[PDB]
Amino acid sequence: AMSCVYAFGSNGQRQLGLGHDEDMDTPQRSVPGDDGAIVRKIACGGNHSVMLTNDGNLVGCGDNRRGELDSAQALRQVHDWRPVEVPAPVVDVACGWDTTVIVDADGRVWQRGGGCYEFTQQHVPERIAVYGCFQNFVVVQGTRVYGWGSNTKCQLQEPKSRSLKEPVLVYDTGSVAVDYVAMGKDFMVIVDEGGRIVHASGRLPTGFELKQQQKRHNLVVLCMWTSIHLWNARLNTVESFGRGTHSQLFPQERLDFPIVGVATGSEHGILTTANQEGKSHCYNVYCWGWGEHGNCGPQKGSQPGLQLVGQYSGKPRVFGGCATTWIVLGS
Amino acid sequence: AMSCVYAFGSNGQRQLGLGHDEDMDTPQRSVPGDDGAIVRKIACGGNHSVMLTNDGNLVGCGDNRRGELDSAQALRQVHDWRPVEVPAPVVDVACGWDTTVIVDADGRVWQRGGGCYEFTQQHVPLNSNDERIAVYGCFQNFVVVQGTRVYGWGSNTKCQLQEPKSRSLKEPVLVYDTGSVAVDYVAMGKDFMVIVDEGGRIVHASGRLPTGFELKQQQKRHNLVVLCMWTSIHLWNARLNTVESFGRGTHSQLFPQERLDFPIVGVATGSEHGILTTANCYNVYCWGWGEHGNCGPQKGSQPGLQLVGQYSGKPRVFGGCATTWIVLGSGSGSGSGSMSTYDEIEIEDMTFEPENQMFTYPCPCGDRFQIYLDDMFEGEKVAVCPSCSLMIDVVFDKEDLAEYYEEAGIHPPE
Amino acid sequence: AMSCVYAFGSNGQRQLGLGHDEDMDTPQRSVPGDDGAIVRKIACGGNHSVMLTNDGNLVGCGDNRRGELDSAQALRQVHDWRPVEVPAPVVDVACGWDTTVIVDADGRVWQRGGGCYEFTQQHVPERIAVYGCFQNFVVVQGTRVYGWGSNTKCQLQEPKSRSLKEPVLVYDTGSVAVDYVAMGKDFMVIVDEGGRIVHASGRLPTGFELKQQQKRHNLVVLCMWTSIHLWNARLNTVESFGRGTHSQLFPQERLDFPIVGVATGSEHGILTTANQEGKSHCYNVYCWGWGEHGNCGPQKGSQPGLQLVGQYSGKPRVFGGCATTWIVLGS
Amino acid sequence: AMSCVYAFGSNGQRQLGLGHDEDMDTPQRSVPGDDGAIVRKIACGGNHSVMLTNDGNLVGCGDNRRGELDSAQALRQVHDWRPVEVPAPVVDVACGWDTTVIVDADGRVWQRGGGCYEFTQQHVPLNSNDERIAVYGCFQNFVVVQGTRVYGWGSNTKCQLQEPKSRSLKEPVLVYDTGSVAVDYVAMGKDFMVIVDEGGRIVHASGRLPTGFELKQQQKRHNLVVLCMWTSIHLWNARLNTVESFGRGTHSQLFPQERLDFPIVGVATGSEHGILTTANCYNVYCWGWGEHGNCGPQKGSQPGLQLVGQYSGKPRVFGGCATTWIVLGSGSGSGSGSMSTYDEIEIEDMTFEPENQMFTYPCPCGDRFQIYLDDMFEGEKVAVCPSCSLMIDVVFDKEDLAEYYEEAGIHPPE
Amino acid sequence: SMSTYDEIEIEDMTFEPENQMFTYPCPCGDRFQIYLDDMFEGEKVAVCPSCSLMIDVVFDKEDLAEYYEEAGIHP
Amino acid sequence: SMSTYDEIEIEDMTFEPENQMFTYPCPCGDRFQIYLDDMFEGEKVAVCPSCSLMIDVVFDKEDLAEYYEEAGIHP
Ligand SMILES: [Fe+3]
Ligand SMILES: [Fe+3]
Ligand SMILES: [Fe+3]
Ligand SMILES: [Fe+3]
């Protein structure tokens, strides 16, 4: 029972937990204080990163100049992985640009950062999950989807209202339960357990016609800051919608390997495929999109196409951040 | 951050930047020194190639027996891509047969080559505002376009600048003057010239026009895109999805009047060959005279379109004298794989810092895009990231700036 | 009434009539003593060249160390175009490696060269024509085909007999008349007026299956030293058979221009096409095959494909030699 | 006369000979200096490329921090194609990880690199006749094959030379010895080795063979063509028209066991990738590990064959460490566009000149191929043209020479 | 009898008095060339040495007198 | 948990006592690398800095004592 964590990419604020502030272009072993408890989720802000283990503990590293990590206001940066002070054991975690949001075992939602150095409870009206990106957060319970934060693009409600401090009702189904919420910079895509898009607010990237996508079944929706990506298991490919200025658009070339996992960072994608060519089956992890900081591998030119960053015997879990890539392995 | 520059065609003076002098019939990667650079625009002469970068630098390669590139008279040829010395950061660049003309950020027009081994300033009467200054050049003529007005100099044997005939004009004269609509660009041939406004209309043409091209008949049309070879004019008709060609066409320069299956998204011309870009991902074709490989492996100059490359993102292409340039991820434009502006943010979503008098906005790398209050008063809307090469556009008016001057407690220069 | 002659290629013995002994890679104006009489045929040896005008005159230039041109044994090389002494006005001419064969107005066949400095009549048993290449000559009259010279490959008869001084009966049809004889180094291809191959002796280059080619109609047969080329007007292409070590094999790519003329030298081809793209129609002349000496144009690397050497308003007549190319224009 | 050498793949130390150090995913023309040269064979190391020409010269580019190319210790890297100094005209060349081994016309084996900045002779016991001397090398082992016998040196940690294990063997030892049939070639991997005779039979194998490869089962087969990657063996089965692969294949090195539509005419391997050549004109494919572009634009190492080029004439390909070389018109071989032997002429058709003691034959350029009587007594049959680059083979026996010695009035050394 | 790429006035040709030759830029980077001595004999076609193309030089015999004088040579 | 390209014996690795690092040639031209300090802590995987690939170094703890001594350093 052990989860190894490998990280690479942007590291200017030591948000990779490697101890140093140098950008990496190959997977580096990121060892916390424990490294014995298994990893549940790795949420990433702009310059900070938090790691939620399955024991309710939450460690973090990176920038703290906006209070996204520790309550010590004189603590500007957390050098290595450090325990994040929480009012109660954490069940789920999410990060905004300079904020951190947790959901504890008591069902309470807490938010720190964005100038606020103290964990402040967000009062939101059975499984409870939290999702966040940029300047927005969302809490999902059953069929109801509550969200707060920015609203300059009508990602929460009507009309354009700069910001909402109090959690509002973003969307209700209100029959089939909501599985997750894939959110970008100023937009949002709500998906049910069936696998179909049920709602989408904010400004969606070009080409993404909402009414046409709501008729499709069994989709896995991923979101970068300025693009939406749809994992189509049936066709074994990823459909991308957006400007694609820096190769964020997934290569429409034939994928011979079976896709078994897809994740996205701020402006890059992480693909996990099944390599079955040997006597033993393994897993290839690819990266596509903007990778100047090495978050896509040694080739940092953001050229179109997949880039192989690693190959593992066990199926890895991957997480994306702001020009950072996290690969989690099971020993 | 790196532009993928492909080059092929005539390489007699190493103007392809490949180190060797062998003619290429398939797109070769041309890498400016080490790790390359972000390439904004490529201009081409008879035997020299000029490559403008995103930060206003000029890198060049090719012949130098006329002083097109380096000031060293002893240097007859530039082996590989070498920095072309400039008096100021370059905004725009054009080339002639053996000349290189630039336009700097200060708004001055400099010209080297043609015997002169030093950048001599060309004195064209211009204004001092955000009317940007564009330069265009071909053969023995250059043209400067600020807005509405078009100034030019060089040869005048065919009356392409004024009347009557003159062997040369050293000092720039007013070629043509609108009107109402600002001049978009000037398509130039060997001894002729075609002026187009932003409405896609042919406002004026001078010099020896190729046969079959009646100026009065074409001036009535609009939404046209005009391209020019040395001895032929090519009108991109997006509406009917075809290119109309005018000239002898003794070497297949006349565009194939066959119904294309793909929509045309880009047309450029070299000296005597054309480069077509279509959709489907993105196909690049070549037609016309190509016995130097500038049209692909088939160098027989047969009629039709040769596929020379297919790309995921829309490339911008440049034509030279029997040469063809294909650039991926330029600086900048718009579209897939363009590596252009990351996003356009409105000033109301921007984070204003009174103490620093600058606007910041979160960058996906972890840093922040930034733009100064003073620079925006001067008409700048581009915010750059001090870490990575990502840029954003700030959407604002001069009226919007007044609010932030009042918040910072500073009187604006109004 | 005037024929301009343009030449280029191998010129080591001044066989281009340009006066100098420098190899040319672009068409050079070759002006004889007359240049007013129209050219009927230009025959080429290894290092000598002769030009037959329609007035019965025959001029020549090049090597004479084997007596292929002038009877003056002390004359080793003919600097510029010079009248070739003939016993009678010439109707047809042909050249071997170091030999010259003419057919006069009296119907007599004369041969000079190959060590013999005097024109010596060849006694051969109505139109009379002569064809020659390398170490063999052929005289065609009606249906009968007579030939002499080398026989080491059974190009004349059976068995292998080193050489035949006396003209023998190579082949009789003997119904339909014989149009011409396309001959290579050590082989031969006989064609009738119908346009079909009727006979082929000597060692034919690989791939050329004789029995299969004799069933085809309307073919124009060309021969290099070690390859056979078939002009197919119907398909508008040239079928090549041989090793093709130096691009002698005609490019099987689609020819958009109508082929209006084909000629071959020792190891290279000359194609004439009709360029109809302008308001005025003109003619493109291409070259393919081995062209180190510039006989194919400025590109002397013998790379595969056609090479444009010129473009003319009137349909040119082309002739091939030993790494030399002759383009004849009408003023 | 010029060979068209295409190169792509790993280019970290400029080993592609393109001047830059950017990895290429499409075949780039590599031009040795000016006007290039006729390329016979290309050998590849870890970070250096060696190119043997038709006249016995070595031209190289790449790393030099181990002395693989130049003797100058100060020179850490060779920028472009530069002449590699040789003690004598080179007949054959091979490369190791950081080593270059040649075989000269005198029959001596020289080795540089691996610390040594000078060509030191390797003393392998050979004979003095027309049993030609071939050299083969990979990783840390080299092998010299004259005929029947196979000598080698280098690493011995996996017992690929003899028994038992040794960290290194500086002096060459007899690896394996036939028998009857002469050894055709030796396919070499990282720590293993496969020896094949002219009958296409695996006569001997040593070292750590990849998994699934039973030596005793394969020795029973014949007419096989053996290729080797670092960690895999590949058998070209022309009869069933397929390549049989043996190894882990964790990066698609295992050849696609799908029925090919075209007949296989050529198979070569790099360090961990394969290059397939098929007919139809001539298509070149790549499979295996290619995340450096050595397999084409797709660098995901997915299973299958990537088309990287199509050619009119059959090219010969060479594999390196994450690099791929394609040569058109080499020196020499056989086939279309090979620029090989022009023709083979029998001595009875040859023109003998007693006064000059040489045989001549008409060349299509106007000159004459020529070969000396003395050289033919020593076993030479190639007649060359003193003007152009055309060559012919003279078909004769030592018995045939007696006639011409009697005609010239000269006693032969018999 | 030549098919020409363009017709050029003699005033537009670049004259080189050193070697009595007229030149003009060619779309391939090279230059069409034609000798003064040839033009006096009636020659009107300039040739590029690296390409197929040809141009016609438009001139009269009396237009040559100026360039002969510039080279310091009489016809 | 890593998928490795090959298994290498420690005797086959190139040791650099200057910076206490083990290297081994990589099919891309570069070298798999692994630090002695890491190997003493149980690390067994060498990594190439320019490529995806990884190898396993086969060694026991007592095999490290020789290389520590060669570098002049104690664990
Ligand atoms: Fe940034
Ligand atoms: Fe020759
Ligand atoms: Fe030209
Ligand atoms: Fe590597």
UniProtKB/Swiss-Prot annotation, chains A, C:
GO cellular component: cytoplasm
Pfam families cross-referenced by the UniProt entry: RCC1_2
Superkingdom of the source species: Eukaryota
RCC1 repeats: 2-54, 56-105, 142-193, 282-329
Molecular-function GO terms, alphabetical: ubiquitin protein ligase activity
Keywords of this entry: Cytoplasm, Repeat, tRNA processing
GO terms classed as biological process: protein histidyl modification to diphthamide; protein ubiquitination; tRNA wobble uridine modification; ubiquitin-dependent protein catabolic process
Localization (cell): Cytoplasm
InterPro entries documented for this protein: Ran_GTPase-activating, RCC1/BLIP-II, Reg_chr_condens
Gene3D superfamilies: Regulator of chromosome condensation 1/beta-lactamase-inhibitor protein II
Subunit structure: Interacts with KTI11/DPH3; the interaction is direct.
Function: Together with KTI11; associates with the elongator complex and is required for tRNA Wobble base modifications mediated by the elongator complex. Association with the elongator complex is mediated via interaction with KTI11. The elongator complex is required for multiple tRNA modifications, including mcm5U (5-methoxycarbonylmethyl uridine), mcm5s 2U (5-methoxycarbonylmethyl-2-thiouridine), and ncm5U (5-carbamoylmethyl uridine). Together with KTI11; also required for diphthamide biosynthesis; diphthamide is a post-translational modification of histidine which occurs in elongation factor 2.
Classification via PANTHER family: REGULATOR OF CHROMOSOME CONDENSATION
Protein name (database record): Protein KTI13
Protein source organism: Saccharomyces cerevisiae (strain ATCC 204508 / S288c) (Baker's yeast)
Curated annotation (Swiss-Prot), chains E, F:
Outcome of gene disruption: Sensitive to caffeine, paromycin, and thermal stress. Resistance to diphtheria toxin, sordarin and zymocin.
Subcellular location: Cytoplasm; Nucleus
Pathway: Protein modification; peptidyl-diphthamide biosynthesis
Record-linked Gene3D superfamilies: DPH Zinc finger
Domain of life per record: Eukaryota
Residues that coordinate or bind Fe cation: C26, C28, C48, C51
Any Pfam family the entry gives: Zn_ribbon_CSL
Cellular component terms per the entry's GO annotation: cytoplasm; cytosol; nucleus
GO molecular function, one term: ferrous iron binding
Reaction(s) the record says it catalyses: [3Fe-4S](1+)-[protein] + Fe(2+)-[Dph3] = [3Fe-4S](0)-[protein] + Fe(3+)-[Dph3]; 2 [3Fe-4S](0)-[protein] + 2 Fe(2+)-[Dph3] + NADH = 2 [4Fe-4S](1+)-[protein] + 2 [Dph3] + NAD(+) + H(+)
Alphabetical keyword list: Cytoplasm, Iron, Metal-binding, Nucleus, Oxidoreductase, tRNA processing
Family, per entry: Belongs to the DPH3 family.
Note from the entry: Present with 8400 molecules/cell in log phase SD medium.
Assembly and binders: Component of the 2-(3-amino-3-carboxypropyl)histidine synthase complex composed of DPH1, DPH2, KTI11/DPH3 and a NADH-dependent reductase, predominantly CBR1. Interacts with DPH1. Interacts with DPH2. Interacts with CBR1. Interacts with elongation factor 2. Interacts with ATS1/KTI13; the interaction is direct. Interacts with the 40S ribosomal protein RPS7A. Interacts with the 40S ribosomal protein RPS19A. Interacts with the elongator complex subunit IKI3/ELP1. Interacts with the elongator complex subunit ELP2. Interacts with the elongator complex subunit ELP3.
Role description: Required for the first step of diphthamide biosynthesis, a post-translational modification of histidine which occurs in elongation factor 2. DPH1 and DPH2 transfer a 3-amino-3-carboxypropyl (ACP) group from S-adenosyl-L-methionine (SAM) to a histidine residue, the reaction is assisted by a reduction system comprising KTI11/DPH3 and a NADH-dependent reductase, predominantly CBR1. Acts as an electron donor to reduce the Fe-S cluster in DPH1-DPH2 keeping the [4Fe-4S] clusters in the active and reduced state.
Name this polypeptide is given: Diphthamide biosynthesis protein 3
